[PDB]
Amino acid sequence: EDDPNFFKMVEGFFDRGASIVEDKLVEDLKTRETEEQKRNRVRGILRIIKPCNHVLSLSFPIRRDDGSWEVIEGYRAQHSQHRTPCKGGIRYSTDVSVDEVKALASLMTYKCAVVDVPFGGAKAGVKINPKNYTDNELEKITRRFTMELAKKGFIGPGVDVPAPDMSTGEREMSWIADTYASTIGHYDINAHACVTGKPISQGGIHGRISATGRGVFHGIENFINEASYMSILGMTPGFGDKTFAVQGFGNVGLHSMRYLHRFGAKCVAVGESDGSIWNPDGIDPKELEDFKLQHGTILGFPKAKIYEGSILEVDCDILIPAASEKQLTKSNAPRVKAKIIAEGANGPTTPEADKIFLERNIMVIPDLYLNAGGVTVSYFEWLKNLNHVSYGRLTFKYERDSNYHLLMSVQESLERKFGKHGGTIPIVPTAEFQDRISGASEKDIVHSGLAYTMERSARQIMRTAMKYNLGLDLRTAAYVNAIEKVFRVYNEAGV
Amino acid sequence: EDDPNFFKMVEGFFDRGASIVEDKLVEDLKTRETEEQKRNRVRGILRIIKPCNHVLSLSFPIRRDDGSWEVIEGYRAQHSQHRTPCKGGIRYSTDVSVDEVKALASLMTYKCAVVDVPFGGAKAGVKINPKNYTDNELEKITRRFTMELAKKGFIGPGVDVPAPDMSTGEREMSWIADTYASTIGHYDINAHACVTGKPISQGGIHGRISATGRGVFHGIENFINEASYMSILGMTPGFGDKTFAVQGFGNVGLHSMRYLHRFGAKCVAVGESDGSIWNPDGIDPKELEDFKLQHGTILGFPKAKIYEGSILEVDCDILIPAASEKQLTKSNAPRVKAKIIAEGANGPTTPEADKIFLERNIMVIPDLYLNAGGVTVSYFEWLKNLNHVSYGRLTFKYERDSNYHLLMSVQESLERKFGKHGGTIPIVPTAEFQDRISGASEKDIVHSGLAYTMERSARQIMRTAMKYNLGLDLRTAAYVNAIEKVFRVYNEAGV
Amino acid sequence: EDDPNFFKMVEGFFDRGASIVEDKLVEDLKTRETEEQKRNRVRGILRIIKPCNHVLSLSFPIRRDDGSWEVIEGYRAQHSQHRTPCKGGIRYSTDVSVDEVKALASLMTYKCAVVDVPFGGAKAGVKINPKNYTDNELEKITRRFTMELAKKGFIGPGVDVPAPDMSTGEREMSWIADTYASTIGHYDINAHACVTGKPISQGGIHGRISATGRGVFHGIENFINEASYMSILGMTPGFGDKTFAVQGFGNVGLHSMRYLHRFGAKCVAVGESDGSIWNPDGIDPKELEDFKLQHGTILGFPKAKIYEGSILEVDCDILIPAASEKQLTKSNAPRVKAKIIAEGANGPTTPEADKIFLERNIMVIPDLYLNAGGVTVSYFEWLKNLNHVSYGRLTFKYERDSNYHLLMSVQESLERKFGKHGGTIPIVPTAEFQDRISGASEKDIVHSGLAYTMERSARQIMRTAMKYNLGLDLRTAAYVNAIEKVFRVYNEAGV
């Protein structure tokens, strides 16, 4: 009950936001036939943006360990190409259908527009349940899948760059890169930039794994510290006195929990497919993770009870959906308790849940902004691959020396003016500037680059929510920017 | 009522035929684990054949003559690649969906297996009604469509070679070739072999337009002259005393009517979308065509009345469906009158109509054989393009001389043995051998090559219908061969 | 008269400068056969530099809006490739001939040598009068032109990178990039680096439009502030008391006027093809531009009279030719009034006008230096495209933090030495260092990079004019450096 066509579901958000700005897009336009044919031409460009450009559907055979033949299905969709290459991960699930992949792909592009990553949207899906395949079988699958994508122009450094999503980690990325760089890209100087989310030894970048969590953190942080928004929710600014619950203890889930906890937030609930756990006094990220690693499940965790009932309904301040889509529907929407909904996963709530949450006066930080930390960091990995140099190497020593001389320049100058009367005036770095004395390292850029991006995009949305009184409809605010940016292109290039 | 999903409908025919042969495919197999794991491996290979390998879905913009923006959808599916390149036409219709294109694509491959054309199956569709677009708009569409196909490996001399289908003629093929050879294939020595059904001046081959009609003729001819099959129908062999009716006065329809009429068959009905016409005394192909060209419709034709009622039900000997799919369904099936059903179009009858026709004892010459004359000739065009010489050029003079000497060798020899007593014994060619004195021409090869193929494939099917007592279930007989052939490749190819 | 072959005209400047340095190029040379065969080998290398390497001549058809067929001609020349790729704009005019394109191409390479941009010279021309073609027809032309260039290796990220010139702006560049990245470069990770001067939304860079004007400004600034040169002209250093007149109110014209005016210079005349305008009290850049945009011409401008007579002869301090070539010839040369000639356009003055201006003691700042600001900025755009990151993104936050700590390091140190006695010694940034606290942004690098380059190259020329007493023959000084740099390269290469 309340199950909408994910693709159209996203189109819904797009159209809603399209209207809001349609007027501006016509005013800025300065063409000759100034008459409202301008208004049609804008609507024409919009009708062009909405649909995917290329969608590849695969069906290929693999040989099961038991010697039998099985046909596996997979898809890869390229939504837009107003920016090259396309970006978007690969989800391994039995729920993948073209409609889903087409939707996630489109979310990737608007996602990038919000966060200013120069990539068009894309997304992949292989209809399998990894839990029923041996490691050996999976590898054969992801490798062969890379090939059939390659052969048709659906993966490449300047075409389409995959990344992780559901049930795919750096292990999968690692095989993808290897297959590509060993075959199609044997001569490509940018071969390893054909995919992101790779192991660091494979050319991955620091913190891409925890990237999304760290991003989710910044997303919330930017909003839970506004008052303008916190008042409307009857909430005190700051994390120190908040309790949250998260659906999905995975890449985006685990790390989301990790960072919030790090800033005095309390995890009162954690969920999965098998069940949810709870504890009003709070659950710890590190022991839960080790229990989960050792036992392969969160159910049974000693310092917490096996909560019976919807993880999406538990009593808390912030609800973090980090599982699959449409978890928050029209049904359960009214029974959420939480004041803040930080959309960790892509499209975890239906259009109607939004509607209800708006009325219920519960703030929903949209997915296409809140979870954009993943690509922001993937983009940094991609730049790293192109550069072929790890940040800081060429300059670590030069800056260090240069910095000590800068500091020595004020010292010797002051000793000159205040003579022997002041004796020596030692100018040493503080503990903080000491940690920076050489300049930024790879770790430093990811951390601050992400932060700069999450913060900067937050303001861009807030600023918009104001200019159009969307109040707590941040999702619409977010799409306005995406459209506003993606449009400025298609317009300025003869479509 | 009864209009199943097209793709599975064809899968239906495949499975049915799969069973019939499954046994043979296991007997011929000579592997080590001779136990019936052999039977699973065969079923495994079959599960692999059935689905399409690659399906590209396009969505791109074109600029309407009135200056507006419209998004047009198109698809191209590559069913199999056990043979390279893929082959199959492009249909321009508003009824094209992936399911349809996926179906037609699969029919192309089995079609080729029956007729022995070394191509894997493929098919394209662009969701538009050509009748609502100017010539200028169409060209923009077909050209841009060729590009988006090219960019993703869905058109190329050794990859996928398109051809005509519904609402696409040599005009469209001509633009396709031009776009390709002018861009992607500028350096390809086989650039113009990227598509068939081209204008002869564009590298087309003689008779490709009337190819399918001529083929349909041969298909019927091979069966309407067996007695073995004609007896079971209570019909005298030969065309001389037969009356037929055809649904669709198009490329496959018009020419089908043309050739049958040429051999003393009488066209009593012709149909279209607007309506059907009739005349028990027979309608003439040439005057109907000129009326149709001059007036843009068959309705109103002077030497015939405007028949009210289903063209598929009119009283005649042979019913030729040359329109779209599923015309003959479970409903109207029982009211057909005709004894012979020559499937001109692809899949014009549902699985149940078959069933009824079997019982009703009405012979149905399957589409995947009867209309294979098109690709057989397309294949000849493709070979012509690769050869870069039209049949006969290099040898016309040599054979002519060589032949006159061969004939002169018996002459001078006989004059030698019978001396002056017999005087001169002139050895001149007959009128027939004179027409061949130089050897086969492009026209000659198409005509006899087609004939050789239609006939040879007919026997292959008949021969099969006997070995498995399918009697009048020729469709199943046809699929048995297709499967039987497509199989061997995969078996010993490394699957 | 005085209408020489634009190509030889430039060759003239080259030979003249060739001689001046020939001696040095032989002295530095340290080969075995030290005898003056060295002097032949240098002359041999020079005979090799002078001519273009590849010149493509195009002739292709376009379809006029009124349905008719017209053949359009175009050329693209690649002068040198001692540096890859080639660089140089596209001029849309009816005056384009191979000789012109070959000339402008050669000016591009020496232009780059003076300014240190690692590109060999190139240039294009399409023989049409844009003023007689609709926007729709132009686009068809520029797109099809990009294709015919592509097909033959005359456009590509690492081959030949076009840019704007006469009657071509970012609109044309935008279509060029689009056609390339959508076809030939669909897989190129550097596809959008196939051309510069693109809209910013298309990957353009900040200030490339006003780049040349800004450059022209710096060019003059570096010379109008030397005294060494200002004395010889009987002129006070500085812009504050100068009046200039410019021929051509276009990309290079308008912005040239803009920047000079910004620094207290007074525009007393502005010209075009239809006519010139004047005002001894000065004309304003902003109102003239708006009049020109609204009315499509400068003639009629309220705050100025319609000057009857040559714009190249008006009374002023500095004459800025920003129109086509050979405007200042032997004829009108003696009647110029201005003391300074800032060659904005490429080769606006004939070899003899030079001669006269030398005698007349009028300083001519050579085109191949003065207007090099365009490529310098185009080069920055190209680097931007390769980098796939806009300057500053990765480091904005890190530097800002790092800087506050640097400043905090002196603060905490001083508070330590001067204890409570000095209380807090707050170390805050000035307004200027505040504007830089995060580091350079894209805007910052273009502006200072251009300045660094214009200034540095000015000194290189002055320094040379001295070592060879060319006094006011800066053109010859400029070519000496170009040759001196390019030669070295063909030298050490294996030729």
Ligand SMILES: NC(=O)C1=CN([C@@H]2O[C@H](COP(=O)(O)OP(=O)(O)OC[C@H]3O[C@@H](n4cnc5c(N)ncnc54)[C@H](OP(=O)(O)O)[C@@H]3O)[C@@H](O)[C@H]2O)C=CC1
């Ligand atoms: N790098 C990334 O992976 C990124 C992902 N995202 C977003 O987050 C989501 C991806 O999470 P990833 O795929 O990152 O998570 P990972 O697969 O690790 O998440 C694993 C967890 O998800 C739980 N889970 C799955 N389905 C449900 C469900 N219906 N209800 C409750 N729990 C469930 C699993 O339980 P079980 O194991 O029993 O299924 C498991 O504990 C995507 O939708 C995407 O939009 C965004 C940016 C980065």
Ligand SMILES: NC(=O)C1=CN([C@@H]2O[C@H](COP(=O)(O)OP(=O)(O)OC[C@H]3O[C@@H](n4cnc5c(N)ncnc54)[C@H](OP(=O)(O)O)[C@@H]3O)[C@@H](O)[C@H]2O)C=CC1
């Ligand atoms: N080279 C080829 O074209 C080949 C074609 N074929 C087969 O023939 C069919 C292709 O026909 P082409 O595409 O050759 O035909 P063309 O478009 O000429 O066929 C035109 C005729 O089809 C009629 N028609 C369309 N829809 C219907 C309908 N729903 N009911 C009755 N009549 C209808 C049209 O009426 P109207 O004009 O008013 O729309 C017109 O008279 C395919 O299905 C294919 O399997 C097989 C091999 C080769």
Ligand SMILES: NC(=O)C1=CN([C@@H]2O[C@H](COP(=O)(O)OP(=O)(O)OC[C@H]3O[C@@H](n4cnc5c(N)ncnc54)[C@H](OP(=O)(O)O)[C@@H]3O)[C@@H](O)[C@H]2O)C=CC1
């Ligand atoms: N990136 C760049 O664009 C660079 C440009 N340059 C130089 O500047 C020149 C380019 O100018 P752009 O092409 O920038 O100028 P744009 O075409 O805008 O210049 C337009 C102006 O040129 C005037 N004009 C053209 N021909 C004549 C003529 N015969 N007599 C008088 N006025 C004339 C036009 O008048 P009207 O409109 O009535 O024809 C118009 O006002 C080039 O030759 C180039 O070497 C230098 C460096 C880089």
Ligand SMILES: Nc1nc2c(ncn2[C@@H]2O[C@H](COP(=O)(O)OP(=O)(O)OP(=O)(O)O)[C@@H](O)[C@H]2O)c(=O)[nH]1
């Ligand atoms: N998968 C996973 N890795 C973790 C986790 N916590 C820490 N890591 C580690 O991240 C490590 C390197 O971290 P760098 O300092 O050394 O980590 P960091 O940037 O300070 O981590 P954050 O403070 O969360 O941003 C790796 O060696 C991982 O073991 C976790 O909860 N899950």
Ligand SMILES: Nc1nc2c(ncn2[C@@H]2O[C@H](COP(=O)(O)OP(=O)(O)OP(=O)(O)O)[C@@H](O)[C@H]2O)c(=O)[nH]1
């Ligand atoms: N539409 C149509 N085309 C025809 C017909 N007859 C011949 N053609 C043409 O086939 C032409 C050249 O044909 P020929 O070499 O004379 O044909 P043919 O071998 O005698 O034709 P069949 O007799 O093989 O059809 C092409 O230009 C077609 O237009 C016809 O009755 N209808």
Ligand SMILES: Nc1nc2c(ncn2[C@@H]2O[C@H](COP(=O)(O)OP(=O)(O)OP(=O)(O)O)[C@@H](O)[C@H]2O)c(=O)[nH]1
């Ligand atoms: N390119 C251009 N821009 C103009 C002109 N006149 C006004 N503008 C304004 O340029 C504005 C943005 O200017 P900026 O990019 O910040 O200018 P800038 O690079 O600091 O300008 P300069 O310091 O002269 O190079 C827009 O909002 C326009 O309204 C003109 O003649 N040419």
Ligand SMILES: Oc1c(Cl)cc(Cl)c(Cl)c1Cc1c(O)c(Cl)cc(Cl)c1Cl
């Ligand atoms: O140039 C390539 C490469 Cl190296 C890989 C792929 Cl998948 C594609 Cl498609 C191309 C471009 C290309 C080709 O290289 C060839 Cl020989 C044929 C085609 Cl129809 C196309 Cl479009």
Ligand SMILES: Oc1c(Cl)cc(Cl)c(Cl)c1Cc1c(O)c(Cl)cc(Cl)c1Cl
């Ligand atoms: O060359 C390519 C590349 Cl490298 C990518 C793509 Cl997608 C396409 Cl379509 C082409 C085909 C192509 C072209 O698009 C053009 Cl204009 C010229 C050539 Cl001689 C070639 Cl071979």
Ligand SMILES: Oc1c(Cl)cc(Cl)c(Cl)c1Cc1c(O)c(Cl)cc(Cl)c1Cl
């Ligand atoms: O790719 C070719 C081919 Cl097949 C032939 C030639 Cl004579 C050349 Cl020199 C190339 C190099 C080349 C290319 O590799 C691409 Cl992609 C485009 C272009 Cl216009 C060109 Cl000239």
